[PDB]
Each structure stands twice: as structure tokens, then as C-alpha cells.
Amino acid sequence: KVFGRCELAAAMKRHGLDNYRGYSLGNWVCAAKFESNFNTQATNRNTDGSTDYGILQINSRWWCNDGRTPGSRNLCNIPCSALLSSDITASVNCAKKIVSDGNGMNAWVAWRNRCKGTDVQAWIRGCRL
């Protein structure tokens, strides 16, 4: 599923991401935009054999089990296929663990390179939240 901007914003707000760990809703929407272009089915194969899954492009080397990444971990206790669901619950809950792992949202490269420091507030512009 490909989310609309405000549609995703509302869903993330519903799942408690607004101001979670000090990051406003705008940061999360911006992150999703540049990580996956709002596509829940997005996947990116990395050079080390791991894969990034879903709306927030969460990596299989540490966060989920895809059964095809040798020597990896599964800290979110979920199959990576759950991160490809149209229901963003799994991605959100795992993301909350990731952002609490000591590096804030810097864990998301796309967010760091295109969202951090900008007026992220513009990402929920015109939304009914």
C-alpha cells in the first residue's frame, strides 16, 4: 500500500509517534517519505546480504527475522514480513525500540540527510490531526 501524506501522518499519530522520544510527528512522516516514499512494500537489498523492510526501512541484520540473513539478530521479535504489512503497527512498535537505542532518529540515514534540521513541520501541513 502507498500512503497519502496526511493519511500516514494520522496513522502514526494514532500509534503514538508524535513527540515520541522527543521527535515531532513531522520527523516521522519525513522519514517515511525519504526512506520508502510511503510504500509499505518497499524493500532494499544491502551489499552485506541484509535487507531493509517497509515504510521505515528497518534492517534485517538486527531488527527482524527474514530467514535469509546469516549471523543476524531479531531484536524486535518479529518476522520481517510483518514490516511489509499495510497495518503499520509492527513497524511503529519496532521503530520505537530503534529510536530508543541510543542514536535517536539518526538510525535512519534518509531522515538524517534530508529531514534533520529542516522545517519538518511542513510535512503535516493541511492535515486534520
Side-chain angles (χ1 to χ4, degrees):
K1 169 183 179 178
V2 175
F3 275 87
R5 181 166 62 75
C6 288
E7 179 187 21
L8 181 60
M12 291 183 145
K13 186 176 183 298
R14 191 178 65 232
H15 285 81
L17 281 180
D18 186 28
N19 293 315
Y20 189 80
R21 288 296 174 290
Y23 290 94
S24 65
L25 227 200
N27 280 292
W28 298 99
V29 178
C30 187
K33 173 61 176 180
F34 297 110
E35 282 296 341
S36 70
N37 199 25
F38 302 146
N39 179 24
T40 59
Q41 309 187 312
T43 64
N44 175 251
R45 194 207 88 84
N46 296 108
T47 63
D48 72 335
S50 66
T51 296
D52 303 314
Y53 297 83
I55 194 77
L56 277 316
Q57 293 286 280
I58 290 173
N59 193 262
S60 69
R61 185 154 248 79
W62 305 99
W63 312 103
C64 60
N65 177 47
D66 64 5
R68 50 177 288 182
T69 307
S72 67
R73 299 296 296 294
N74 174 14
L75 285 313
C76 282
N77 189 197
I78 58 169
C80 301
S81 62
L83 298 179
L84 299 178
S85 177
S86 293
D87 179 324
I88 71 174
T89 300
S91 289
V92 171
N93 291 341
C94 187
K96 289 180 176 174
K97 188 185 181 70
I98 294 173
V99 70
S100 307
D101 211 35
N103 305 114
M105 286 193 67
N106 292 300
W108 285 280
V109 60
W111 170 83
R112 183 199 305 147
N113 293 344
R114 310 223 61 145
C115 305
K116 191 181 182 180
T118 68
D119 173 43
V120 298
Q121 179 176 53
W123 288 96
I124 60 178
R125 170 174 67 209
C127 296
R128 177 197 171 188
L129 308 172

Short mmCIF file of all heavy atoms in Angstrom, two decimals, residues 52-88:
data_model
loop_
_atom_site.label_atom_id
_atom_site.label_comp_id
_atom_site.label_asym_id
_atom_site.label_seq_id
_atom_site.Cartn_x
_atom_site.Cartn_y
_atom_site.Cartn_z
N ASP A 52 16.36 -4.07 4.00
CA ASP A 52 15.60 -3.06 4.74
C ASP A 52 14.15 -3.27 4.35
O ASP A 52 13.83 -3.35 3.16
CB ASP A 52 16.05 -1.64 4.35
CG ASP A 52 17.53 -1.41 4.57
OD1 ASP A 52 18.05 -1.78 5.64
OD2 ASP A 52 18.18 -0.84 3.66
N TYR A 53 13.27 -3.35 5.34
CA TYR A 53 11.85 -3.59 5.09
C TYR A 53 10.84 -2.52 5.49
O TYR A 53 10.96 -1.88 6.53
CB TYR A 53 11.41 -4.89 5.78
CG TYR A 53 12.08 -6.14 5.28
CD1 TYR A 53 13.33 -6.52 5.77
CD2 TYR A 53 11.47 -6.94 4.33
CE1 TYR A 53 13.96 -7.67 5.31
CE2 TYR A 53 12.09 -8.09 3.86
CZ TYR A 53 13.33 -8.45 4.35
OH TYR A 53 13.94 -9.60 3.89
N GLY A 54 9.84 -2.36 4.64
CA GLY A 54 8.73 -1.46 4.91
C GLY A 54 8.83 0.04 4.88
O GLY A 54 9.81 0.63 4.45
N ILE A 55 7.75 0.65 5.37
CA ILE A 55 7.58 2.09 5.43
C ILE A 55 8.77 2.83 6.07
O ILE A 55 9.09 3.94 5.66
CB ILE A 55 6.26 2.42 6.20
CG1 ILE A 55 5.85 3.87 5.99
CG2 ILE A 55 6.41 2.08 7.66
CD1 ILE A 55 5.24 4.13 4.63
N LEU A 56 9.42 2.22 7.06
CA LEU A 56 10.56 2.84 7.72
C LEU A 56 11.90 2.15 7.42
O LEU A 56 12.90 2.42 8.09
CB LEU A 56 10.36 2.90 9.25
CG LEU A 56 9.54 4.04 9.87
CD1 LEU A 56 9.91 5.37 9.25
CD2 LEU A 56 8.08 3.77 9.67
N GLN A 57 11.90 1.27 6.43
CA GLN A 57 13.11 0.56 6.01
C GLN A 57 13.97 0.05 7.17
O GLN A 57 15.13 0.43 7.32
CB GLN A 57 13.94 1.48 5.11
CG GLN A 57 13.25 1.76 3.78
CD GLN A 57 13.30 0.58 2.83
OE1 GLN A 57 14.31 0.34 2.17
NE2 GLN A 57 12.21 -0.18 2.76
N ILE A 58 13.38 -0.83 7.97
CA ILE A 58 14.05 -1.43 9.12
C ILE A 58 14.89 -2.63 8.66
O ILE A 58 14.40 -3.50 7.93
CB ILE A 58 12.98 -1.82 10.16
CG1 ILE A 58 12.41 -0.53 10.76
CG2 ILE A 58 13.57 -2.76 11.21
CD1 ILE A 58 11.23 -0.71 11.70
N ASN A 59 16.14 -2.66 9.10
CA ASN A 59 17.12 -3.68 8.70
C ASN A 59 17.08 -5.05 9.37
O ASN A 59 16.95 -5.16 10.59
CB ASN A 59 18.52 -3.08 8.85
CG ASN A 59 19.59 -3.91 8.17
OD1 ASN A 59 20.28 -4.70 8.81
ND2 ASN A 59 19.73 -3.73 6.86
N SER A 60 17.24 -6.09 8.55
CA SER A 60 17.20 -7.49 8.99
C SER A 60 18.45 -7.99 9.72
O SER A 60 18.44 -9.09 10.28
CB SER A 60 16.96 -8.40 7.79
OG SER A 60 18.08 -8.41 6.93
N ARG A 61 19.53 -7.22 9.72
CA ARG A 61 20.72 -7.70 10.40
C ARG A 61 20.54 -7.62 11.91
O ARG A 61 21.14 -8.40 12.65
CB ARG A 61 21.95 -6.90 9.96
CG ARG A 61 23.25 -7.44 10.57
CD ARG A 61 24.46 -7.11 9.71
NE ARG A 61 25.06 -8.31 9.11
CZ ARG A 61 24.59 -8.95 8.04
NH1 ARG A 61 23.49 -8.51 7.43
NH2 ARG A 61 25.21 -10.02 7.58
N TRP A 62 19.70 -6.70 12.37
CA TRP A 62 19.47 -6.54 13.80
C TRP A 62 18.03 -6.61 14.30
O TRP A 62 17.78 -7.13 15.38
CB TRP A 62 20.01 -5.20 14.28
CG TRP A 62 21.43 -4.91 13.99
CD1 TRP A 62 21.93 -4.16 12.97
CD2 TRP A 62 22.56 -5.35 14.75
NE1 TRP A 62 23.30 -4.09 13.05
CE2 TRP A 62 23.71 -4.81 14.14
CE3 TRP A 62 22.71 -6.13 15.90
CZ2 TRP A 62 25.00 -5.04 14.63
CZ3 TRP A 62 23.99 -6.36 16.40
CH2 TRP A 62 25.11 -5.80 15.77
N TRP A 63 17.10 -6.08 13.52
CA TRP A 63 15.73 -5.94 13.98
C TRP A 63 14.62 -6.95 13.71
O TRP A 63 13.67 -7.03 14.48
CB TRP A 63 15.25 -4.55 13.57
CG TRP A 63 16.26 -3.51 13.93
CD1 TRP A 63 17.15 -2.89 13.10
CD2 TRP A 63 16.56 -3.04 15.25
NE1 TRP A 63 17.98 -2.06 13.82
CE2 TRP A 63 17.64 -2.13 15.14
CE3 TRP A 63 16.01 -3.30 16.52
CZ2 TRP A 63 18.18 -1.49 16.26
CZ3 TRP A 63 16.56 -2.65 17.62
CH2 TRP A 63 17.63 -1.76 17.48
N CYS A 64 14.72 -7.72 12.63
CA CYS A 64 13.68 -8.69 12.33
C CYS A 64 14.28 -9.94 11.70
O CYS A 64 15.42 -9.94 11.25
CB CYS A 64 12.64 -8.07 11.40
SG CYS A 64 13.36 -7.52 9.82
N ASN A 65 13.49 -11.01 11.65
CA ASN A 65 13.97 -12.26 11.06
C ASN A 65 13.39 -12.49 9.67
O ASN A 65 12.17 -12.54 9.51
CB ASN A 65 13.60 -13.43 11.98
CG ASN A 65 13.99 -14.78 11.40
OD1 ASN A 65 15.11 -14.95 10.90
ND2 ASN A 65 13.08 -15.74 11.46
N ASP A 66 14.25 -12.60 8.66
CA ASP A 66 13.75 -12.87 7.32
C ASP A 66 14.23 -14.24 6.84
O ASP A 66 13.93 -14.66 5.72
CB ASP A 66 14.12 -11.75 6.33
CG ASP A 66 15.62 -11.59 6.11
OD1 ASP A 66 16.41 -12.39 6.64
OD2 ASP A 66 16.00 -10.65 5.38
N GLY A 67 14.97 -14.93 7.70
CA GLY A 67 15.48 -16.25 7.37
C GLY A 67 16.50 -16.33 6.26
O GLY A 67 16.86 -17.42 5.81
N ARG A 68 16.99 -15.17 5.81
CA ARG A 68 17.97 -15.15 4.73
C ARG A 68 19.15 -14.22 5.00
O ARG A 68 19.85 -13.80 4.08
CB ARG A 68 17.31 -14.76 3.40
CG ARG A 68 16.45 -13.52 3.47
CD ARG A 68 15.88 -13.14 2.11
NE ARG A 68 16.89 -12.61 1.20
CZ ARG A 68 16.64 -12.18 -0.04
NH1 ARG A 68 15.41 -12.21 -0.52
NH2 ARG A 68 17.63 -11.72 -0.80
N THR A 69 19.37 -13.89 6.28
CA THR A 69 20.47 -13.02 6.67
C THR A 69 21.30 -13.73 7.75
O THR A 69 21.10 -13.52 8.95
CB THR A 69 19.95 -11.68 7.24
OG1 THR A 69 19.04 -11.09 6.30
CG2 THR A 69 21.10 -10.72 7.50
N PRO A 70 22.25 -14.58 7.33
CA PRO A 70 23.08 -15.31 8.29
C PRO A 70 23.82 -14.45 9.31
O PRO A 70 24.30 -13.35 9.00
CB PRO A 70 24.02 -16.12 7.39
CG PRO A 70 24.07 -15.34 6.11
CD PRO A 70 22.63 -14.90 5.94
N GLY A 71 23.89 -14.96 10.54
CA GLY A 71 24.56 -14.26 11.61
C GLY A 71 23.86 -13.01 12.11
O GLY A 71 24.47 -12.20 12.81
N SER A 72 22.58 -12.85 11.78
CA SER A 72 21.84 -11.66 12.20
C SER A 72 21.05 -11.86 13.49
O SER A 72 20.95 -12.97 14.01
CB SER A 72 20.87 -11.24 11.09
OG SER A 72 19.85 -12.20 10.92
N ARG A 73 20.49 -10.76 13.99
CA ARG A 73 19.68 -10.77 15.20
C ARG A 73 18.25 -10.38 14.84
O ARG A 73 17.96 -10.01 13.70
CB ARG A 73 20.25 -9.78 16.22
CG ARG A 73 21.67 -10.08 16.67
CD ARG A 73 21.75 -11.41 17.41
NE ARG A 73 21.00 -11.39 18.66
CZ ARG A 73 21.31 -10.63 19.71
NH1 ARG A 73 22.36 -9.83 19.66
NH2 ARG A 73 20.57 -10.68 20.81
N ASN A 74 17.36 -10.47 15.83
CA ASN A 74 15.94 -10.15 15.66
C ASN A 74 15.48 -9.50 16.96
O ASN A 74 14.73 -10.10 17.73
CB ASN A 74 15.18 -11.45 15.39
CG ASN A 74 13.66 -11.27 15.35
OD1 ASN A 74 13.16 -10.15 15.26
ND2 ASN A 74 12.94 -12.38 15.39
N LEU A 75 15.96 -8.28 17.21
CA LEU A 75 15.64 -7.56 18.44
C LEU A 75 14.19 -7.14 18.61
O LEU A 75 13.74 -6.91 19.73
CB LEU A 75 16.54 -6.31 18.58
CG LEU A 75 18.01 -6.45 19.00
CD1 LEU A 75 18.12 -7.38 20.20
CD2 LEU A 75 18.83 -6.99 17.86
N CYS A 76 13.45 -7.03 17.51
CA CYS A 76 12.05 -6.65 17.64
C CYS A 76 11.15 -7.87 17.80
O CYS A 76 9.94 -7.73 17.98
CB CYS A 76 11.63 -5.77 16.46
SG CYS A 76 12.22 -4.05 16.63
N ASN A 77 11.75 -9.06 17.75
CA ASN A 77 11.00 -10.30 17.95
C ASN A 77 9.86 -10.47 16.95
O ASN A 77 8.73 -10.82 17.32
CB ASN A 77 10.44 -10.32 19.38
CG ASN A 77 9.83 -11.65 19.76
OD1 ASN A 77 9.07 -11.75 20.74
ND2 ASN A 77 10.16 -12.69 19.01
N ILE A 78 10.16 -10.24 15.68
CA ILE A 78 9.15 -10.36 14.64
C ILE A 78 9.74 -10.75 13.30
O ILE A 78 10.93 -10.53 13.05
CB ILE A 78 8.43 -9.01 14.40
CG1 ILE A 78 9.47 -7.95 14.02
CG2 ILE A 78 7.63 -8.61 15.63
CD1 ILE A 78 8.88 -6.66 13.49
N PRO A 79 8.92 -11.35 12.43
CA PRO A 79 9.41 -11.73 11.10
C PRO A 79 9.42 -10.42 10.31
O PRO A 79 8.58 -9.56 10.53
CB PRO A 79 8.35 -12.71 10.62
CG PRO A 79 7.10 -12.24 11.31
CD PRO A 79 7.60 -11.96 12.70
N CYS A 80 10.38 -10.26 9.41
CA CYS A 80 10.45 -9.03 8.63
C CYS A 80 9.21 -8.83 7.77
O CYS A 80 8.87 -7.70 7.41
CB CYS A 80 11.69 -9.03 7.74
SG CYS A 80 13.27 -9.18 8.65
N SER A 81 8.52 -9.92 7.45
CA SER A 81 7.31 -9.84 6.63
C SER A 81 6.25 -8.98 7.31
O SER A 81 5.40 -8.37 6.65
CB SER A 81 6.76 -11.25 6.37
OG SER A 81 6.39 -11.89 7.58
N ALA A 82 6.30 -8.91 8.64
CA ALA A 82 5.35 -8.11 9.40
C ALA A 82 5.57 -6.62 9.14
O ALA A 82 4.65 -5.81 9.27
CB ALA A 82 5.48 -8.40 10.89
N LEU A 83 6.79 -6.26 8.77
CA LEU A 83 7.13 -4.86 8.49
C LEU A 83 6.65 -4.42 7.11
O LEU A 83 6.77 -3.25 6.75
CB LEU A 83 8.65 -4.66 8.60
CG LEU A 83 9.27 -4.93 9.97
CD1 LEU A 83 10.77 -4.70 9.90
CD2 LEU A 83 8.64 -4.00 11.00
N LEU A 84 6.12 -5.36 6.34
CA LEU A 84 5.61 -5.10 5.00
C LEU A 84 4.08 -5.06 4.98
O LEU A 84 3.46 -5.01 3.92
CB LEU A 84 6.09 -6.18 4.03
CG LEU A 84 7.60 -6.32 3.84
CD1 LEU A 84 7.88 -7.46 2.88
CD2 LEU A 84 8.17 -5.02 3.30
N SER A 85 3.49 -5.09 6.17
CA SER A 85 2.03 -5.08 6.30
C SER A 85 1.45 -3.69 6.05
O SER A 85 2.13 -2.68 6.27
CB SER A 85 1.65 -5.56 7.70
OG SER A 85 0.25 -5.50 7.91
N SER A 86 0.21 -3.64 5.58
CA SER A 86 -0.46 -2.36 5.34
C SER A 86 -0.82 -1.77 6.70
O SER A 86 -1.13 -0.58 6.81
CB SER A 86 -1.73 -2.57 4.51
OG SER A 86 -1.40 -2.98 3.19
N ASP A 87 -0.79 -2.62 7.72
CA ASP A 87 -1.06 -2.22 9.10
C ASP A 87 0.32 -1.87 9.65
O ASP A 87 1.14 -2.76 9.87
CB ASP A 87 -1.64 -3.41 9.88
CG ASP A 87 -1.93 -3.08 11.33
OD1 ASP A 87 -1.16 -2.31 11.94
OD2 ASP A 87 -2.92 -3.61 11.88
N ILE A 88 0.58 -0.59 9.88
CA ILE A 88 1.90 -0.17 10.34
C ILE A 88 2.24 -0.44 11.81
O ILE A 88 3.28 -0.01 12.29
CB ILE A 88 2.13 1.34 10.09
CG1 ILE A 88 1.24 2.17 11.02
CG2 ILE A 88 1.82 1.67 8.64
CD1 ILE A 88 1.52 3.67 10.94
#
